[PDB]
Amino acid sequence: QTDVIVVGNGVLGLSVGVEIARTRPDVRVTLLGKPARQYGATPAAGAMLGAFGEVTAHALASEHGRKKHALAVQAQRLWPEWIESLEATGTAADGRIKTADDTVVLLNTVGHSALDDANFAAVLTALKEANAPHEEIAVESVDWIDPDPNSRPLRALHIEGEGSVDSGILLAALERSFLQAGGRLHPVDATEIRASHGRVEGVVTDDGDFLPAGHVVVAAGARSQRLVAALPGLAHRIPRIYDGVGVSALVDTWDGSGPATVLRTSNRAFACGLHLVPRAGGSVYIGATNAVCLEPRGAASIEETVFLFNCATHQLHRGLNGSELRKVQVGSRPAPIDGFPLIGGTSVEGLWMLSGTYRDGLHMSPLLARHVVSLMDGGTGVDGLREFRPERDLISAWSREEILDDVVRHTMATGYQFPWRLPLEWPHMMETFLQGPFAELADRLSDTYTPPADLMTAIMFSEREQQDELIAYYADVHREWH
Amino acid sequence: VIVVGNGVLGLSVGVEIARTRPDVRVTLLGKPARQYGATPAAGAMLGAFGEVTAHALASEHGRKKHALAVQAQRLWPEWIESLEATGTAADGRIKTADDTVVLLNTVGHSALDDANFAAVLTALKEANAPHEEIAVESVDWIDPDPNSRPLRALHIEGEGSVDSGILLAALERSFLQAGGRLHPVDATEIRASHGRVEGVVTDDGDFLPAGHVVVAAGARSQRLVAALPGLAHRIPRIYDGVGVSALVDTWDGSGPATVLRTSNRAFACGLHLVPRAGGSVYIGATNAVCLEPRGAASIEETVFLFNCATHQLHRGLNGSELRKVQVGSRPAPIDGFPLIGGTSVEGLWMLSGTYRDGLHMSPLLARHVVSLMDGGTGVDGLREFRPERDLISAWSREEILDDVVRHTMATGYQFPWRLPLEWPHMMETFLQGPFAELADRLSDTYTPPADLMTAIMFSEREQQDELIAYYADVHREWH
Amino acid sequence: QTDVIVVGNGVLGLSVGVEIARTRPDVRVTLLGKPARQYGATPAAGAMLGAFGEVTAHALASEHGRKKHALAVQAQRLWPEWIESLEATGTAADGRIKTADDTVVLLNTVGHSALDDANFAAVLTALKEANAPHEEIAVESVDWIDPDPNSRPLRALHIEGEGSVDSGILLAALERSFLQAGGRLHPVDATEIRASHGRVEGVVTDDGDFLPAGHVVVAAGARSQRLVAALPGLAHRIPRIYDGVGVSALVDTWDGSGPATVLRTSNRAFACGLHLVPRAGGSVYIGATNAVCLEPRGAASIEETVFLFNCATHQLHRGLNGSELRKVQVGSRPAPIDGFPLIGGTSVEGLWMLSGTYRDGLHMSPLLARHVVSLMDGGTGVDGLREFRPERDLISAWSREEILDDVVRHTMATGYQFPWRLPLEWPHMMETFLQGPFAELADRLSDTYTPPADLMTAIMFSEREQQDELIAYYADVHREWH
Amino acid sequence: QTDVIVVGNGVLGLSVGVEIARTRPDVRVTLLGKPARQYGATPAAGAMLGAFGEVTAHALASEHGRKKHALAVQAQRLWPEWIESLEATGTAADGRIKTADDTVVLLNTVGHSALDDANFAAVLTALKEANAPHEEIAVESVDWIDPDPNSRPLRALHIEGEGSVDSGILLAALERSFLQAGGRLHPVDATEIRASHGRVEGVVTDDGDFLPAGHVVVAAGARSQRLVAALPGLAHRIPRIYDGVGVSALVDTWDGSGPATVLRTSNRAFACGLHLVPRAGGSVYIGATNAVCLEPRGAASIEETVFLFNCATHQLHRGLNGSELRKVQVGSRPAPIDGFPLIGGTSVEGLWMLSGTYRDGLHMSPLLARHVVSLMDGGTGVDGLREFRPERDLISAWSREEILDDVVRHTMATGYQFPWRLPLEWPHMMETFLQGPFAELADRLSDTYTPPADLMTAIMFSEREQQDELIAYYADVHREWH
Ligand SMILES: Cc1cc2nc3c(=O)[nH]c(=O)nc-3n(C[C@H](O)[C@H](O)[C@H](O)COP(=O)(O)OP(=O)(O)OC[C@H]3O[C@@H](n4cnc5c(N)ncnc54)[C@H](O)[C@@H]3O)c2cc1C
Ligand SMILES: Cc1cc2nc3c(=O)[nH]c(=O)nc-3n(C[C@H](O)[C@H](O)[C@H](O)COP(=O)(O)OP(=O)(O)OC[C@H]3O[C@@H](n4cnc5c(N)ncnc54)[C@H](O)[C@@H]3O)c2cc1C
């Protein structure tokens, strides 16, 4: 069997499917997944082609973070030809994948100085270091925005050639391009990967059928590790992936207008953020919340909807207040337990993984697809992706001290982003009383592993049973790798 | 008989006709989509005493409307029994709560909330209704923000709620069981000649003949009848009272045993939670009178509804899952009172303009119109709400101008805003002039109620001018 | 002539001075203290004749609290004849001591339900138990008030015969009555009490002079214990008194109007509260903040002034916003470390103490004065003031558990009273993270003594050196008494 | 009589007194005014030597505004030698007049974009046009400040050589320098200026005395025009001066620290502003509110104190919250009805006026003093000050349209500066409903004169009788000059 099965119909599954089908016209490539795309991240995405917009001081302070950033900058160079190659299989009436060429990053005071001020400085530095075209511009020169004056930006950064795509039109163009290249869509879900004598045999589907294959590529988003972890030994050799549950919305604007550019803040408390992505036809996309959940969730909370709407109406455009809500969207960012993606080969011959991309899998998709296809054809793919091999000991990209500083800063940032109004002694009081319980949790979980802040807050407020299960997991991983 | 409309009023009258006249063919029009439908967006509360305001009970027309709501409450137990009788256990229960708790908090204007709470208490005592002012600590389930918490609570016995979705299903089933036929199309035009109804042209191009046409098309009811000769200025206009509500799956699957509500608030919105089966709660409900229909919630409406419920009722709703944002059009009559009964056109009847409490009044209104169709006199106090009439003037222009400014200020206090203390008095004084000027400009005789006056104040000049023309044409017709 | 020296020129010193001079024509009575009245509580007081208004659920849950309450109810009965006897020594132009006969207690939502709702219920219960004349009234029937609707009361309680005095006119009338009865005012401060062979010899003054006496009555407010603690053994036998620093203000109202009654809330976080006391001549008194300080402070903080003004303008009358500020007043409530007053005799012959009355020494003054004068004349004074003898082991009126529940409730109440606006998950988060540090502090301070909540918060946020000094103090007290 | 009487003991009276006494050792110069300095602006001032810091877009849009700005830049050059000459008459223990050399202007979002953003741009432009030393600096590089993150600055401007003086030390140094130069201080107030045959005879004082003089210089702050208006015809020939009532405070900082520079915002709603001026000895000055009052007021309102304290603690330093309030200061900025100063000679021989300097008389004092002394000695003084001659038709520096735009913008700015939290439709609603009543008022007051925004808001909210009296005044001025 030289047959290829791609498990997953998100941006990563379809992107790798398209690259395999185009590159190996000799082989049969079958892509699994249903049109409902349950918990799907890609359909809930705007989406921003975020390289520089995703820069944080905390990310760029670690070697693993600087490597992830380098890959995002590399991926940006592939997008123009990738889009051309996908629109080539379609006509004008299919709609345009690209919705904006440029991004404006806004700095307002509706957040923590320790995140927003540091992150704005880090973005400016990363742009200069990469020789990317950009300009700090007068806020008065930013098109379209009409913020509440008390929520308004005082600094603005124009990033040239950092744009957005319509995630729905991208998925349609990938499916069309996949079929054009001879790929076959089988609208069922994989239940189980079959392997024996350290080699893949194929996939059992949820209609009871068995599909044989020499290659299985797992791109099932937040379900990817749970699917592979069933194979012998792999439960403690493939890092867990959780659901980074994200809420976004489509709004029909009061006057049918929209901005010419992406409008965004830097990443904010626990990897949420505020952005507006232009859409065709009098629609705008607003996003996006983030909460790491130990179990999947397919519905927005009241809190998430209110926070998203309140931020957009005050910080971007008060006209959105009177605008019509068309759709609340919910998707699961694949959130890796060690904070880095799972991309490449396994100890099982013919078994590949493309997952754990959290906030920027869609942006990195053309690079990640080409990397995995290179590896499948006996190549070395892309240089900096080696460290993010899916079969690995949990990465420790930061000291426990750095993470404990970060988790307290991010907790305080949930206050400043609201924005709260409190007596002035309360924030210092909460800072001092948060340090102890988070230090105690970190020490209790493991002697070697520390979860990143986004996951640590989820664990802090989870049931005792869920905490104990994670202590067991971390201990089993240490046993396996040490 | 053709019933035009598949809301609570159309189906309720359809069921009563089909059961009462087994000799006649009754056909009910309307689509399963129920576009702009009020009934599916309703909780719904069987609100009689809960709907009492000081402003309503200060007018004779308001006191008449209240009397009818108290009468309607007595019909509900046997009405529900008669609708559930046509179904089985698996169809679910129409009744979702027996009792209501009215909460008084300070997240609103004293001039509405304090006056309205006193008016509810008075109306209960006057009607000898079973009720008790209770300790807030004794209210089950609620977990408000302390700064948004109630300091007074009122338990109303036998004032409850129904599942509006299960009610609609039970009405459709009961209608079919009684020999009614559902034709899922919309009426485009009522046909009449020699002052008598001939039937209805439908939107699939067909013509259905009838000796009787009952218009219960919610907010579309007057626009449908106004096409017939003279009736444009003889049937009071009905606008869309666009309302937003939501279904929430609670964090722990719990819900309150009773309806939880405030009194009616700025421009006939209000905060309430209606129990549902299966770990769901209904939260409602916004209200904005729109001169044109709107089928989607605004961001502002969604945020206001969620913010009020999480702070004033239960902070646990914050972490609860949003299942559905619902939008419907309360039929908002331009003179503030319903359109119920016969026309100058033989066989033409209207059941509409019920705004906030058509669903509660439905069994009474259905029986009234069926009595009239059988040559009876129906219910005594419904005469004044005959659909073919001069616009009612239930309040002085002065009362309405006081009310519209109070309600405008109440939008601030309900937010709740935080302002420099001189700003509210400054806004009160600068609001009075423009609203007095608008009222004087619109007509020398008619004043729109506050809910509609705010919509007109912030409408286009062309829409204002069209209303000046309408009011002038009505005065010409009746004076 | 067998000389008596009263050390202190507040309400308690002058009240006891007047009672001695009137009752004992045989004794020469000299009263020390300067007209500046440094750190003086009495001049900063409104003052309310608070018996029922001062009731809290927490106070009435302890035996010591119920005893203190009984004495406040007894003191109320003495005020009419006491005022008559003080005004008798003056003329019309001296002004009236009594400023109001009745009090209205208001319940609004600008505070914690766990204090304000419980305390309102406790006031209502105490009134019914005492058969005191009172009526729950419609808020619309409360005269004069014009609150912000979002800060308005929804319940109101009229207390008949619970009134107020002008503290300044009371002090003037006491000084005049003291002179009329043959008392002498010596405007210097005591530096040292002289004692040998377990008997008082007299007082060294701060002008270097020595005044001989057979009797010394210490009524020096918050300085009372520090003055007596210099005598042998008494450092660990007289409970420490700290400064309950309070800020109040005199305001000339926009229209010269004022309310006919006292307007107040129940006691709020850390024994502060909101009240308005009527004054003559188009003036109103607004009060009053409270912060226990381990060292004296004679100036208002910005925070205290803003909190007091914000509460009064929103919760009582918006007209106060445009009213003229005449005076910011600061005084030290004598705050006893064990939460109960220091009234009566010492192990030193002729040495008496009248202090540690915290919030209601002025109200209790005629009763306390008569008690101590009775004791000095060989009488038994008033029943049930025995328990508040100044030379004692620290009282433990509450379990450590009760105090730890109270300190967390009061801490949260500082938020609700502001009032803050926070994300809805934050208060529960702060409640859970406050419990641990306060339990840890309580355990560290002593194995037997627990400071009441008002003092525990001050110790929690004091320097490590001040905490260690208090650990030493508590240990030295245990050694002395066990 | 060659005797000179200076009426007023503020910065302008004493500055002109010193210059006359030093320049004319042959003449007797007597300076009137009491040490209480009732309604005195100078003692309530920080004070900033504000030239560029005082720049607004609205001021620099008028020719009269640009002229006033040029004079402020000229005045700055005189300060170093002026201070040297005043300190020369004293000793080390008298303390230093200068308290800072530099100013940092901060831009935060606690205000209207239409004032704060425009004014920050106008300051930057005025600095570049004048070639003045300045630098836009990183906010993180601003020393000492510790703002609430939600109230923090995002832009900062360092202005070199724009500093501050201690107003109290300046007044002491001026009085001492006046005596050293042979001036005599007579601590009484002028009641009446005596003139006949178009020449000054002298001054009747409030102790009933008459002082003869050939020269009377009126520098009585906000009382200056009311004093001269009693002389024949001058009621409608000298523009009215009102009280710009200002509230400031002296604070002892928590740790005795203070900033090395002035910290300020640009001028805000109705010519108030937020600033901190360094002082010696662990004190800081915070200011300053402004409200034009048609009658004098000597006491702060609650509202003014709360606004000043809230702005300083949130926007400058949260440490000020726990800092001790030493003094609330109130003074009357002389607010000319036509918005420009009254400097120079009259139609009455020997009668001079130095007044109506509003926010920057103290800064301009050395220039203004030298101008008037030059004129008295038959010189032409300083070129651009001719236009601000005290005997004039009311200046119309702006169109009625410009003022109506300004008054509505400033009214809305009172909301954004609070800062308020409102439903997003409310500000647009208030903007539209404010325009009509202010247009109606402006049209009713006069067909030719429009009061500037600061005065127009005061007139809008004054009694009908006060409005009618102003209609009469404006009509009488038109009659006199047309
Ligand atoms: C948010 C919200 C909350 C509410 N809460 C309550 C509550 O608590 N208690 C209460 O008593 N009531 C409540 N109501 C509803 C209120 O009682 C209304 O007055 C009542 O539902 C109106 O019923 P109706 O049948 O007249 O109109 P609808 O329910 O609107 O029904 C009219 C129907 O006619 C159809 N139609 C329109 N045009 C045509 C045509 N040409 N031909 C055929 N069909 C047509 C529409 O699609 C619709 O389905 C609420 C309403 C809303 C929107
Ligand atoms: C803001 C505020 C509000 C209050 N409101 C009320 C109220 O509503 N009702 C009420 O009943 N009470 C009220 N009180 C007061 C409370 O009852 C006090 O407990 C009471 O005033 C204590 O009186 P005192 O005479 O013991 O102390 P103080 O009034 O402090 O008098 C002590 C005096 O002794 C002087 N002194 C200090 N050291 C020496 C020395 N060595 N030699 C000589 N003299 C010395 C001090 O300068 C001072 O003048 C309030 C107090 C404050 C601060």
Author numbering:
A (entry chain C), C (entry chain A), D (entry chain B): 10 to 491
B (entry chain D): 13 to 491
Sentences from the paper on this structure:
X-ray crystallography was used to investigate this complex enzymatic process, which showed Orf1 has two substrate-binding sites that sit 13.5 Å apart unlike canonical FAD-dependent oxidoreductases. One site could accommodate glycine and the other glycinothricin or glycylthricin. The resultant product is no longer sensitive to aminoglycoside-modifying enzymes, a strategy that antibiotic-producing species employ to counter drug resistance in competing species.
To probe the importance of C281, we mutated it to alanine or serine and E426 to Q426 (a residue related to NOS-formation). Biochemical assays confirmed that the both residues and the NOS bridge are essential for the reaction to proceed, as neither one led to the end product (Fig. 2a (iii, iv), d (iv, viii)). In contrast, both C281A and E426Q mutants still exhibited similar glycine oxidation activity, and the R342A lost the glycine oxidation ability but held the same ST-F binding affinity as the wild type. The adduct is stabilized by the Glu426-water dyad through a low barrier H-bond (2.5 Å) and poised for a nucleophilic addition reaction with glycylthricin.
